Amino acid sequence: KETAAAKFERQHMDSSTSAASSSNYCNQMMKSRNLTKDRCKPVNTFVHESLADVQAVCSQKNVACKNGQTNCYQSYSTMSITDCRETGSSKYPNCAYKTTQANKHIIVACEGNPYVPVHFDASV
């Protein structure tokens, strides 16, 4: 199995690099993280901050989740993130992505005991 928390780390945490290393980044990462195993996941965001920093967002600004739930939190500071988005040549099993770096606030849904990030909601 894999807990919601471990799953979030797998799909969204990349503390090794401070930014989107290169145009090749998303292609390597989406595959490496097993995000292109059952289909090409259309979009995915990686956060280049420490695990502790991202978990701390659960005690930050409480905001509404896109699905209407109220367990979402927005970071007070901007964080380094990389957006991975499908290219047109993208054809399963040959998934292709466009790597895009930016500094934005992240919004994550948190749950459990301890209270940790379980889902990436949005970035603003």
CATH number for the domain harbouring residue 35: 3.10.130.10
Tally the domains of the chain. Answer: 1
75 contacts 106 by C-beta, under 8 angstroms: yes
Query: By residue range, what is the domain housing residue 44?
Result: 1-124
Q: Which of 11, 12, 71, 105 is catalytic?
A: 12
What's the chain's Rg over C-alpha atoms? 14
Catalytic site includes residue 48? no
| Technique used | X-ray
Is 45 one of the annotated binding-site residues?
Answer: yes
Catalytic residue among 54, 119, 120, 121: 119
Q: Which helix (H) or strand (E) holds 8?
A: helix 4-12
Residue appearing with tokens 């920093």: 53
**Inter-CA distances, 34 with 24, 84, 105, 124, Å:** 16, 14, 25, 26
Question: Is 12 noted as a catalytic residue in this protein?
Answer: yes
Helices marked H in 13-60: 25-32, 51-55
The annotation status of 104 as a binding-site residue, yes or no, is no
Q: Tokens 């603003």 — which residue?
A: 124
Residue 48: which of 17, 9, 11 has the closest Cα? 17
- Expressed in Å, this structure's resolution amounts to 2.0
